[PDB]
Amino acid sequence: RIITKAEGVYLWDSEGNKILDGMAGLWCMNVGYGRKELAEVAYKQMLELPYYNLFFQTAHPPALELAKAIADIAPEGMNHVFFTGSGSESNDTVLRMVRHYWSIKGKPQKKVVIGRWNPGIVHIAQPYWYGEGGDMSAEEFGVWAAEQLEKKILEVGEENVAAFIAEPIQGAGGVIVPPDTYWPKIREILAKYEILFIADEVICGFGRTGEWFGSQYYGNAPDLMPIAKGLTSGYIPMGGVIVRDEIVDTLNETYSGHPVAAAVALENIRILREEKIVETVKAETAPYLQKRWQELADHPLVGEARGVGMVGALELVKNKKTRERFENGVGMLCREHCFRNGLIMRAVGDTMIISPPLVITKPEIDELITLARKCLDQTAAVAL
Amino acid sequence: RIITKAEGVYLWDSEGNKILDGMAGLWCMNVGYGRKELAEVAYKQMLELPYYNLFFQTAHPPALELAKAIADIAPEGMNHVFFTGSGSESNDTVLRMVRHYWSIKGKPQKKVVIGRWNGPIPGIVHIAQPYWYGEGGDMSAEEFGVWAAEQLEKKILEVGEENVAAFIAEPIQGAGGVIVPPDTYWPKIREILAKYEILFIADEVICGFGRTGEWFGSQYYGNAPDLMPIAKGLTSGYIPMGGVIVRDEIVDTLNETYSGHPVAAAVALENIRILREEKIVETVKAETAPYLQKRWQELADHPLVGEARGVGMVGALELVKNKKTRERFENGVGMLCREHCFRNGLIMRAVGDTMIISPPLVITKPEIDELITLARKCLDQTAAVAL
Ligand SMILES: [Ca+2]
Ligand SMILES: [Ca+2]
């Protein structure tokens, strides 16, 4: 089976079957497929002035306009953006920035970066209530998971710690939506220590939560935000790091951004802004998606349905009260039914996930929900 | 000065003045500016199937064809390529691979990578660069080549082989001043590498995709590296992309994100196709580079020029105040020469008091003549002011 075209939220195989791409390529095709404007802007920039030269610049350098355009939608006080080739490059880049920052402040011992489960890096607990909450409520567990950050800081010693790094919501790990008490508690902990906050926005960035950034959805004011994916809606490779102004001022005592990529990202943000795609997500599309997605919680196979904005997860279990999982693996089986039925929904163990294009319509959401329920029924038949 | 269009080797500013881009953007615009084919393939890939999806493969995935295309021109035995977003990403990637390699072989202590000055970063140490003009002292070129290579063996023993993962080196150091090593350098390095347990990383970000007249600098000098970071010339700078080309034995071990974005890959595939089917690299080797290097030597007669050197489609000029002693001017001259270049419409980079070129590979013999005329003018104007 072979893909020959794509348009909106749909792929078409060579036969003529439409597949609803519920994962937006790789959490990235935010304006959907077939957006001619993006190809046209790339084409023109490539012919006109594809790249930099050592002496002189162009009329309206797209990278500069892009940086201003991102400065206008980023959290307040984050008006610098350093461009890269990719999201993984942005993650390497942020780790270097944080270490250089503290080194320039005269504290080169602050090297350790604290991340979350799922070589100068240590890990704390992820705020995954369903899998790791034990006997606690969501609210209590959110507090506890946040407190693991303070505990790790003290254990490693503040004077050895550079930064905490975290996605607002962990994507690839299973759309792990944290309790509402998680981020407020983390902010309290960050306020007490000398530690930079890296908010990894590679997935959540450019509209995915209904705000421009996951950080704005939860009310976080980070120091650095790696971005990619939604930056270009996956149409051309590009990454970046958005940086709080004070951090840059310190750093001021390769990242220009390729003009073709920058032209595409600028047009992509323009479309997201001028067609009110992120506004529509917040006001209409995401509330509708999350409401319909909850209906799947009734399904005999589903232990929990969760989500925020345009992401969601379903936990597939054998027993809803104990959260006991099936032997072997229901997720792989459910995925195969997804594959057969023409719905792209990723399996992460026994967790099913979606991340559709942000332009997905209410009828398209209905289709997604119908296909998902069908796949859950077929999986239950085989498993229950 | 503001650039409004570009074509072949030329930029045009808003007033219609032509600037000869002697640096090929940043050592990367190998097929020149204005190659419609590259924009067309990007456009079509972007509209049709811009990216991966989780379930089903695409008709003719450009990244797979690109990997085959690079396997066909890479040094022999290097038939795997891992894609990245950029050359600096490829350099991070390759340092991780060499450390993972030795870790999988059961020797996670081999972590240290030996590079060269002008090539703190934990896990990297540096040896001497084979820069005869600046650091050759009282040695001949041939003997200094040997000595600079021997510093690698000395560093290996000093660090201890059991702590060493790899040696990393460009065939010719580009950004450092087109430091062309003596002919005895690479053969001696190969002898040293053969005696130790050490991977050879040949950094081809600049030298790659035709710049020396071979596809890779490694082929120009007869090296057989284990890993080669690439970027730039991969797409001729039209779309960001990087990669790492890896020797098959290394991969077999490693087998005990790098897919390459389809739009970039379509452009790189078309770019290599053009370089191959128009015989651009062959023409460089047989015609263009010999002509460039011959004309570039003529500037050695200039009162300001202590040495002219180059290989393929790169070159350097050393600006000195006294040709007999190699004494340099009091804190300047490179930037002054660059300002004259800027004014006269030639892009030549200044690295200290070393002037450097790296033109597009499609540059013609009349264009080379123009470059040489402009360079000599810039040297005259610089001498007038400084000598
Ligand atoms: Ca702002
Ligand atoms: Ca052969």
PDB file of C-alpha atoms and ligand atoms in Angstrom, chain A residues 71-72 74-75 77-79, ligand 1:
ATOM      1  CA  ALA A  71       8.522  37.293  19.050  1.00  0.00           C
ATOM      2  CA  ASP A  72       4.902  38.538  18.615  1.00  0.00           C
ATOM      3  CA  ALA A  74       5.757  33.858  22.073  1.00  0.00           C
ATOM      4  CA  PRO A  75       5.364  34.299  25.818  1.00  0.00           C
ATOM      5  CA  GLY A  77       9.768  38.663  27.322  1.00  0.00           C
ATOM      6  CA  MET A  78      10.948  36.063  24.788  1.00  0.00           C
ATOM      7  CA  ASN A  79      11.855  38.109  21.764  1.00  0.00           C
TER       8      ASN A  79
HETATM    9 CA    CA C   1       6.957  39.522  22.407  1.00  0.00          CA
END
